[PDB]
């Protein structure tokens, strides 16, 4: 009985949201930034090659000092690297070797990893015994871990193939909040720079903006034709970029609630694995299944440069917090530092 | 030369880590990795019992060879998102229940999962060890029910040998890379203690053939 007016109301609500969005599209971003100026040619060199993993690297994360980085491979290893000298600081044996994500804590004291075992393991890096040990095993997801990010030393947000995200209390090992609403596997998270919001991208071609303290979903962004694999906030936290299997990156605005730019080329047909912005947000970097990383002018949707130098799929990217370098990890088991 | 004392000590620690990483890589490369797939209610658990909540790993040693087997059932997530993690396993063990022909039909669903796994892009060079389970129940039900309930274009003797050979051929037909990967087929029971021997023989064959390719002999 009421199910009928319920679907009527949902359909009219979707129409009304689209009408409100159309009302705000007064001029495309491509028209405002057309006369600003080009970035010319971006040309980056491999400065470091980080060697030592023996299988496909799946994930990498910079520390906030912009010198240490953590790398996750399916050899069952987390390696913490000193990128200036290429020294290995720590090699951490993982209990399960199908790791898909890894996170460096912003204080530098902790590291997290997870994957096909459905668990987020927290590793204490600064013990009195001199070795790295598991300090928590956050269990409660019913699908694989695809992404995790520390908010504090005690909080972390995880995305899962069971279509959910969760906030954790690391000390008590409980889920503080659950974020339901996606209908496909959640592949990626990005924390806002003030960490009061985060954005997730699921295997339903949608992205969602979540309130961390309230647990409610504020905004839903559509437009991709296929699964969103990667997501990254813009430096000021008012926009974010997505990367999909449909061979496209898209830029979304939070306060206009719309897509503002598409980054695509006829000779790019493969899906995108990772995305990140340069320090000013001028450049968007994207890793691909065709073994490259393209550099985009984020304001003019131009290909500004390529980072070529991997022999398998570029699986993960990272720009340092000071903007000095980009790391690329690959399925060929190498990390490369560019500049 | 131009390093400080603590710099040289950090370099020495990094090289000891490198040594340990090479030893663990050499130890991992001598192991056999098996991905264990199967349909709903197909005889995987009995196979796991013979060989011995995300991914479930099983370790066993047999005749000087070490085995790792990964049961990825209960992983209720889109396979296309994690199935590339197993590109590089030695072989795939696929369990099918022979009694499912007369129960979409369970046999057709099993054929479709097999066809999907066999011709996946990540498994072009990956041999398959196909375990046909519950052959006892199959020989009981095949006397009371013809195989035509799932293969209406079948014609042949309603005996266990004929129908089972026909079904093994129906499964081997789904391989569309017959000159790239092999399919190893063994009929098993809940009591067959020769299943680990069959797995070991097939895996030795896979190893010999991977090494033929990798020695250039192709």
């Amino acid at each position, epitope marked *: 009985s009421e199910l009928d007016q319920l679907r009527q109301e949902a359909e009219q609500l979707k129409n009304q949201i689209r009408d409100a969005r159309k009302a705000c599209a007064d001029a495309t971003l491509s028209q405002i930034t057309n006369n600003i100026d080009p970035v010319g040619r971006i040309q980056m060199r491999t400065r470091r090659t980080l060697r030592g993993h023996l299988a496909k690297i799946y994930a990498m994360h910079w520390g906030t000092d912009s*010198r240490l980085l953590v790398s996750a491979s399916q050899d069952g290893k987390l390696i913490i690297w000193d990128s200036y000298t290429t020294n290995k600081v720590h090699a951490i044996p993982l209990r399960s070797s199908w790791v898909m994500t890894c996170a460096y804590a912003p204080s530098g004291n902790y590291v997290a990893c997870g994957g096909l075992d459905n668990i987020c393991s927290i590793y204490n890096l*600064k013990t009195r*015994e*001199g070795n790295v040990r598991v300090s928590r095993e956050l269990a409660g997801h019913t699908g694989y871990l695809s992404c995790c990010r520390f908010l504090d030393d005690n909080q972390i947000v995880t995305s899962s193939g069971d279509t959910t995200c969760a906030l954790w209390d690391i000390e008590t090992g409980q889920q503080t909040t659950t974020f339901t609403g996606h209908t496909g596997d959640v592949m990626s998270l990005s924390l806002a720079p003030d960490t009061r919001l985060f954005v997730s991208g699921a295997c339903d071609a949608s992205a969602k903006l979540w309130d961390v303290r309230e647990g409610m979903c504020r905004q839903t962004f559509t437009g991709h034709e296929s699964d969103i694999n990667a997501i990254c906030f813009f430096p000021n936290g008012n926009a974010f970029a997505t990367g999909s299997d449909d061979a496209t990156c898209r830029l979304f605005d939070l306060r206009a609630d719309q897509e503002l730019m598409t980054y695509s080329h006829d000779n790019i047909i493969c899906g995108i694995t990772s995305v990140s912005f340069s320090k000013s947000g001028r450049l968007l970097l994207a890793g691909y299944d065709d073994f490259n990383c393209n550099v985009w002018d984020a304001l003019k949707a131009d290909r500004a440069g390529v980072l070529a130098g991997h022999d398998n799929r570029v699986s993960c990217l990272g720009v340092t917090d000071d903007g000095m370098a980009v790391a690329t990890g690959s399925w060929d088991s190498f990390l490369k530092i560019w500049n | 030369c131009t390093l*400080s*004392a*603590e710099d*040289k000590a*950090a370099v020495e620690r990094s090289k000891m880590i490198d040594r340990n990483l090479r030893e663990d890589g050499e130890k991992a490369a001598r192991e056999v990795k098996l991905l264990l797939l199967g349909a709903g209610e197909s005889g995987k658990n009995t196979i796991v019992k013979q060989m011995k909540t995300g991914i479930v790993e099983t370790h066993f040693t047999f005749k000087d060879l070490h085995f790792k087997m990964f049961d990825v059932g209960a992983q209720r997530s889109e396979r296309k998102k994690w199935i590339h993690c197993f590109e590089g396993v030695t072989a795939i063990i696929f369990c099918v229940a022979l009694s499912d022909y007369d129960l979409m039909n369970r046999m057709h669903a099993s054929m479709k999962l097999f066809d999907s796994i066999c011709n996946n892009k990540w498994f072009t060079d990956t041999s398959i060890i196909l375990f046909l389970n519950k052959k006892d129940l199959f020989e009981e039900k095949i006397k009371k029910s013809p195989l035509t309930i799932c293969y209406p274009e079948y014609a042949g003797s309603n005996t266990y040998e004929e129908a089972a050979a026909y079904i093994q051929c129906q499964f081997e037909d789904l391989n569309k890379r017959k000159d790239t990967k092999e399919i190893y087929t063994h009929f098993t029971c809940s009591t067959d203690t020769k299943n680990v021997q069959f797995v070991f023989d097939a895996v030795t064959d896979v190893i010999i053939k991977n090494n033929l390719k990798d020695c250039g002999l192709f």
Partner: single-chain antibody
Amino acid sequence: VQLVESGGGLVQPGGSRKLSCSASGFAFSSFGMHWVRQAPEKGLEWVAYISSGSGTIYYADTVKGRFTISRDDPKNTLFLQMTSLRSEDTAMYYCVRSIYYYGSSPFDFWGQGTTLTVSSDIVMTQATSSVPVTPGESVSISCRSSKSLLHSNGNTYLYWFLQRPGQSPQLLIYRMSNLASGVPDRFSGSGSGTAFTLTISRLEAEDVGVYYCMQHLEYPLTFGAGTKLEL
């Protein structure tokens, strides 16, 4: 974390002795180990270093050829085999653990010690030996180096240790400015490269002892003569 030395006692000059350090409570084989010794009324003197993994060994010039440092990792034991013992080897011998990687804190745990009674170095200068203090007040301890401790990599390899009257030394500051784990914020260190300062904000009664500056730029590690705080 515990380090227990044994094997000391009264010996005759020219004899031999083996000191042993038993570790418990930490990954012994990940830490490089040092022997540091202290004569009855004198300051700290570095003796020997064995690397983690035994691939690097250093000796002070005064013990080279006579002392051999060795390590038993499965047994968590450090050894110092001394031969041709002289009367200048009368000291309490300490066992110090030390781990080296980016951001690590070397020289952070010292054993209780073992007493042995026998019948182009960088000079660290602590011009003052003794300083009278009242609790609740601030104090500055100065150290100067024969050679610049600032390295081209940006680190200044100066360490501050405190030895309370009856105890083994404690690491206060490593790399000239970093506060060691467990040490109150009242301690701060600053300096130039050849001149250094340890500042105490408000004294307390547990802050009376001898303070030693150590350089960790080149081997052999060299200590200051120590500044003593008297309440």
